[PDB]
Amino acid sequence: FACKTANGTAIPIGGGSANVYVNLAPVVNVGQNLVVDLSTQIFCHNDYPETITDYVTLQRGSAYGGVLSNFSGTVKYSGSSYPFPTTSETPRVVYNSRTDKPWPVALYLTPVSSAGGVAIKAGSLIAVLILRQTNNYNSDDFQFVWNIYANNDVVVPT
Numbered sequence: 001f002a003c004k005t006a007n008g009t010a011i012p013i014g015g016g017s018a019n020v021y022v023n024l025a026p027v028v029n030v031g032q033n034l035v036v037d038l039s040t041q042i043f044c045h046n047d048y049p050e051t052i053t054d055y056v057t058l059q060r061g062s063a064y065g066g067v068l069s070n071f072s073g074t075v076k077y078s079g080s081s082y083p084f085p086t087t088s089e090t091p092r093v094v095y096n097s098r099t100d101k102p103w104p105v106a107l108y109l110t111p112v113s114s115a116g117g118v119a120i121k122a123g124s125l126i127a128v129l130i131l132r133q134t135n136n137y138n139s140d141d142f143q144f145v146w147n148i149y150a151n152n153d154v155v156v157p158t
């Protein structure tokens with residue numbers, strides 16, 4: 001089991017970490033969602049589906065910088081919504097193919113009432129998402145750590 005980003009940055013068998021730089025909607029109003037869809041950014045696969053089944057969860061999702069200070073968050077994992085920053089490990093998504101399958105993670109961030117102006121700074125860390133991978137074959141329990149950075153400023157009109 002291993003993962004890679006859209007630009008081809010890989011995290012190999014055994015886990016590790018990678019930086020993910022994402023484009024954000026430049027203008028987000030109060031009452032609207034800023035959507036950070038990682039399913040277009042992160043792809044994983046099973047290296048031995050003939051014999052092994054892989055289990056993948058969002059173990060933990062943390063908010064940083066402007067997202068932590070200026071947004072109320074929800075994370076959608078494989079069709080279900082949970083608080084973001086997270087309060088528990090999600091259910092599993094099964095990986096049973098050698099063909100790449102997106103990691104079905106999306107952040108839904110809406111501005112808090114106090115937000116206004118540059119709510120996210122370009123180049124700043126906005127989130128850390130931990131993909132936890134196990135299986136039905138051995139004792140492997142690996143973390144794939146995804147550090148999410150903003151490519152641009154995000155303004156909340158006042």
Ligand SMILES: OC[C@H]1O[C@H](Oc2ccc(-c3ccccc3)cc2)[C@@H](O)[C@@H](O)[C@@H]1O
Binds near residue numbers: 052
């Ligand atoms: O995706 C599946 C797994 O791929 C890796 O582990 C193994 C472990 C054993 C074998 C193997 C076993 C018998 C004969 C030949 C190869 C192949 C892969 C490792 O990533 C792991 O966590 C992940 O569940």
